[PDB]
Design a protein around this ligand. Structure first.
Ligand SMILES: Nc1ncnc2c1ncn2[C@@H]1O[C@H](COP(=O)(O)OP(=O)(O)CP(=O)(O)O)[C@@H](O)[C@H]1O
Ligand SMILES: Nc1ncnc2c1ncn2[C@@H]1O[C@H](COP(=O)(O)OP(=O)(O)CP(=O)(O)O)[C@@H](O)[C@H]1O
Ligand SMILES: Nc1ncnc2c1ncn2[C@@H]1O[C@H](COP(=O)(O)OP(=O)(O)CP(=O)(O)O)[C@@H](O)[C@H]1O
Ligand SMILES: Nc1ncnc2c1ncn2[C@@H]1O[C@H](COP(=O)(O)OP(=O)(O)CP(=O)(O)O)[C@@H](O)[C@H]1O
Ligand SMILES: NC(=O)c1ncn([C@@H]2O[C@H](COP(=O)(O)O)[C@@H](O)[C@H]2O)c1N
Ligand SMILES: NC(=O)c1ncn([C@@H]2O[C@H](COP(=O)(O)O)[C@@H](O)[C@H]2O)c1N
Ligand SMILES: NC(=O)c1ncn([C@@H]2O[C@H](COP(=O)(O)O)[C@@H](O)[C@H]2O)c1N
Ligand SMILES: NC(=O)c1ncn([C@@H]2O[C@H](COP(=O)(O)O)[C@@H](O)[C@H]2O)c1N
Ligand SMILES: [Cl-]
Ligand SMILES: [Cl-]
Ligand SMILES: [Cl-]
Ligand SMILES: [Cl-]
Ligand SMILES: [Cl-]
Ligand SMILES: [Cl-]
Ligand SMILES: [Cl-]
Ligand SMILES: [Cl-]
Lengths: 358, 358, 358, 358
């Protein structure tokens, strides 16, 4: 389990005049890297043949560390190149996945922006729910078993895409079976089934930034998810949908910008404030930098959080050129990637790097 | 009924070197206030405990006038603080509502950007329709009674959310009853029922600005509404929707940016030109500053206006950092809030304040 | 058939110090013209009474060539005004249509940005499919006859809006007949019927720019289409849709910005690279400047191209003030219109005009 | 004598995705490095303890190559670090001096922006005069010996500061002797004495840029020299100067911005055009990038060139934030350093690196 001192004392051997920002070339790296450049940093992008073109043509990376496959980023060899470049790593979804979250927590000896420990509170549904519940945030009702279904529910399986909607116990088994005989779910997944209230409302994935330097939760932007096949499915007229044998899937393919009704911003900020206050208690020092509440706004104007991330969320890509909210601070086209880099910049200049790395 | 002279002569006692822009902290105030700052104004934000965080963290307000509840903004005490700060008030939805439109028309003795009189032509469906019809704009067919229904209609009740769709007289009563026994509509609302043609098409809420200084209608931007539960409802596959007992509601929760097919801009501009030419005749001096046509584009490329506002519409929040249309004028990230402030700026500099306040 | 030399030698008689950019006032002209101005060009806009207001109020045109009807832009009289203004014409959908594609290929003697020959590879479904197939891009399955239908298909008629969805041979004829007796399709259209796999997924219209100066395919932005009545139709709850007798139409009314999942950008770039490499072989010099792949992302994260353009696509209007992708290059609000003008600028400065005009 | 192929083939082994700009930390490096960063390059600054603070605090250097003394920059060890960083070196006064011009011409195996050969045409008074005379530029009259003095002359010695003014042969020896007995000049310097017409007029050091990509001479800015003790000496009232025993020295200490009378710009441009046309003939490929004519404007509005440089002149420091002339191109705060970096940028993108390096 990587210690702080184990990290601070690695950063102490860094050339503090040549500190770079590094990340894996995927997920949200385009504005992580662009944002870094805009803040005056030189940037390092871990990449591989076949997947490096976007980073070359957008010209956001000063140095490339090529790997055979992204799984190699855990390798001690890459950790060394990174340390020799004085890189502070900015973590994201793809990086945690390809590196392996366990390798991240105790085998990845490179300074990393954010709270290293809290990355597993986002990966485990039990910890997430604990956090969200204890922070006092609205979540969907959970159902222990298919027999408890008394309304419309969504059912999630960590399997192969692993989703269906049900309005009764009977329907639950009809659909589970369908997906089983169709070769998408095994009985192991069917037992793992997570059943929750289906919330009917508008999607707001809210992107926050907690600055430990300023001790302030900031609102940076919002997106709604664009998912396949579901957003294609519901674009088929009902009469034709009824003639089809098609199951909804919810694969993230993209994002669409959205802004919320302004009278709801006090709720939005309170939600971020609460998450932050509680996460300080449960996982010190708490949330560091970017975090996302993925919510649904019901007809009673209550935001229900069905998901959260403890680092930068893919939806930040929707405002790489700045957004309506990020503009208000200083009238600039500020991305989340640039807001991260600036926190790193300040921290270095104020000699408070210990507030933002681990 | 607040006179012009009653207002001009209050503005004459203003320190013309220290003129501020004020508004209530809600609805569209973020870019009203940010836009003001960007134009060099000091800004005043009426706010209250529990609802002030967004305005503090986005740093758009130089001075805060705190109230116990937003209903107090009609109070003579707040009118005085505002007058002592040399504030020109920028009105919007939440402000007119919390102040009370009657208090606005004859009890609110603070200079106000726009045409004070015309604020009630947006609040009364009879005046709106009169205006839109007389301006020569396409509107949905109206139906006098449930018995006149010969197609799909939408039905609106000023009640508690108060909407349903019907394709027959019989269906109208089936649904009215459902909502009655469900405790959403009383027979008073059911009689008040407004029935109109359901227009099937794409939503464009078009944001215009009429400059009385330039005598020109400008196009600033467009959004589509993001409403709950309807936009959540239609995201459920048809087969599952049929298994649910759920009524559509249309609560505004947010906005999504959109641009229109360019060949349709002459229609768009003609619509704004017509609204303006007629409103000059019907309510002198007519439209002043921001106004919105909320339209649906049918398959015949005709924009049908189902609603309008005579001040700044919430949808302007979608381009607080500028939009595709607002950019064209000077290549700037121009919000509606900033366009309002600039009109105020010019007016002061050209000594033509009488063209924009009342 | 307009020769290159026939064009180069017309451009040689041009005052190379006074080169302007011209286009017809429609489709995408707002940012074509604005982009030109931003790059230092004087701009020419072909327009007509009743349709000139947007170009006057947005102030993007320095000179107006008025016509009686846009059909007159083929007239030798307009070709001369254009040549006397040293105009390089930027072609787009509306221009090719109003001028007539045949008049464009051999009767329009004005220098034109792009590959003149390739404009008809976008107009003919046989050439398009050839190109896309030979480039190795995923396309929807084609069906030779209604009898071959073994899934859900979409059916396209070049007629009056000319679309329907079918899941069986029987349904195909039920619907064809409906549209026939309804006066939308004649038996000539019904024979012309193009049947293809209905792809269920998320719409990404991807806007690329191939720079022959840099020999590089660039990603500029993405939109999703906003079509009527379909996007209005599917916003009606299923229960109400079933009570209606309504056919879906797919008239382009507007666009909504979207960004793609970042891990998919290597696929996105590969697709543009492949299209470009093949079009060089099939229609020398190949793609010049703006081109669009109109795709659907299925649940397997495969982009299926159902359409393409070989010039600037209307969807570029969604980022006239720049977009998340166009920002990354130099942190600027770069439109496609401005990217076109810059290529023209460079070409002139480097004396490589022969790489971009025809 | 470093060959082109010897350099091109070293640059061919460069990672063309990671090309940096390098220079020695002095002379004009601040805007060479800042300009590079602004164009998207990562920057390398050769520096040493005691002289690195300005480059650290202005944050213009991403990587530092420390040396013991600047004389070490000729060392094969530094040439290697530079080659491993894919650095293109931007040469300037201090760099040529500390490296040694002979080491530069045939011992410095790093790609270098500009025409390597022509660096010695600026170092030798005979070549300079040849060039300037053959280009057809006005220069001060030369005098072969003190006996030829028939007016006011300035006398230059390459010695220890080594200057005096004389109006007669007698005065020449009076002053030479004074400086000899004072320990500033030895008889070797006194024989080396260069005597030329003293031009009475206004100093314009004109900074040009020849773009081989565009084949165009550009005007970037102008400064006047600020020299000690002379500019301090002449600030003493005449009556007091006569009471002092003080000799004028002309040590460059700084620069002051100046703009020229606009009617003189055709002369200014013609001078740069002529220098460039001739230097192409005399030293192929001629002038590459920045060059300076150091001139005096006599009362007849004729610019007399008393000096020139074939690379970037220290006076460019006066417009590191852009100047009145550099602004006109694109309304940007363009330094010479940034104009150099942009030429490098373009060259790489257009695959024309062979036009700018040697
Ligand atoms: N309680 C709920 N009610 C209604 N819809 C829900 C829901 N929970 C999830 N969804 C829909 O299903 C999608 C997938 O939800 P999930 O909880 O799997 O998010 P996620 O972000 O963890 C999946 P991934 O990480 O693969 O993007 C959501 O984006 C949302 O559109
Ligand atoms: N004639 C019509 N046809 C189809 N849809 C309609 C319609 N009139 C309204 N709608 C839908 O119902 C929603 C509510 O319409 P309404 O006329 O109540 O607008 P509004 O702006 O006055 C309500 P609020 O002020 O609460 O936002 C609209 O945003 C639109 O989506
Ligand atoms: N294979 C397919 N599967 C699913 N939907 C499809 C499809 N092909 C087309 N569509 C839908 O139908 C619309 C019209 O498609 P079409 O192929 O006519 O594009 P287009 O751009 O040539 C028509 P226009 O030129 O008039 O805009 C598309 O925008 C898409 O929404
Ligand atoms: N012919 C002339 N008439 C009048 N003044 C002259 C002159 N030649 C030079 N000077 C003055 O003497 C100064 C030094 O001139 P010099 O010819 O040594 O330039 P330089 O740039 O080669 C010296 P350094 O390289 O040390 O700056 C000039 O900057 C100018 O002010
Ligand atoms: N664009 C997005 O919203 C997004 N993109 C990726 N992700 C999440 O990040 C994870 C890794 O992304 P990728 O599979 O593209 O490498 C995915 O499993 C997904 O949960 C997102 N939420
Ligand atoms: N974001 C919006 O479009 C929006 N936000 C608010 N409004 C209108 O302004 C009125 C007051 O807003 P609020 O209820 O958020 O204080 C609301 O009733 C609604 O009609 C909107 N149209
Ligand atoms: N906004 C758009 O996407 C768009 N606007 C126009 N078009 C295409 O250009 C053609 C010409 O446009 P217009 O009919 O607006 O003159 C249309 O038939 C359509 O295919 C588009 N794709
Ligand atoms: N600021 C200037 O004009 C300037 N600074 C330096 N130089 C020239 O560059 C040569 C090297 O500069 P330095 O001595 O500062 O290292 C000096 O001998 C001088 O001729 C200048 N012309
Ligand atoms: Cl985030
Ligand atoms: Cl994510
Ligand atoms: Cl508005
Ligand atoms: Cl509103
Ligand atoms: Cl395009
Ligand atoms: Cl198009
Ligand atoms: Cl120079
Ligand atoms: Cl110099």
């Amino acid at each position: 389990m990587i210690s702080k001192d184990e990290i601070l004392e690695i950063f102490d051997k860094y050339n503090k005049d040549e500190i770079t920002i590094a990340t894996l070339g995927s997920h949200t790296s385009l504005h992580i890297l662009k944002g870094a450049k805009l803040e005056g940093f030189s940037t390092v992008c871990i990449t591989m043949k076949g997947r490096d073109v976007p980073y070359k043509r957008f010209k956001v990376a000063d140095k490339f560390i090529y790997v055979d496959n992204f799984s190699d980023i855990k390798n001690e060899e890459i950790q060394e190149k990174l340390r020799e470049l004085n890189s502070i790593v900015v973590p994201h979804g793809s990086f945690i996945a390809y590196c392996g979250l366990d390798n991240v927590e105790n085998s990845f000896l490179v300074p990393m922006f954010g709270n290293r420990r809290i990355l597993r509170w986002e990966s485990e549904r039990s910890l997430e729910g604990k956090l969200l519940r204890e922070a006092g945030l609205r979540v969907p009702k959970k159902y222990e078993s298919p027999e408890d279904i008394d309304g419309t529910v969504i059912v999630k399986f960590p399997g192969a895409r692993g989703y269906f909607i049900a309005s009764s116990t009977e329907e639950f088994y009809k659909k589970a079976e369908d997906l089983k005989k169709r070769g998408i779910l095994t009985d192991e997944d069917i037992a793992n089934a997570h059943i929750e209230e289906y919330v009917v409302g508008t999607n707001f994935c809210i992107h926050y930034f907690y600055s430990p330097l300023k001790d302030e939760v900031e609102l940076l932007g919002m997106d709604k998810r664009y998912e396949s096949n579901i957003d294609g499915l519901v674009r088929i007229p009902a009469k034709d949908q009824l003639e089809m044998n098609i199951n909804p899937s919810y694969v993230i393919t993209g994002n669409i910008p959205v802004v919320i009704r302004e009278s709801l911003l006090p709720q939005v900020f309170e939600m971020g404030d609460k998450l932050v206050a509680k996460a300080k208690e449960l996982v010190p020092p708490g949330m560091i930098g970017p975090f996302c509440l993925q919510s649904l706004c019901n007809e009673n104007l209550e935001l229900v959080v069905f998901e959260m991330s403890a680092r930068v969320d893919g939806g930040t890509n929707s405002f790489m050129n700045g957004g309506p909210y990020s503009f208000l601070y200083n009238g600039e086209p500020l991305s989340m990637g640039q807001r991260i880099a600036r926190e790193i910049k300040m921290a270095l200049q104020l000699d408070m790097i210990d507030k933002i790395i681990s």
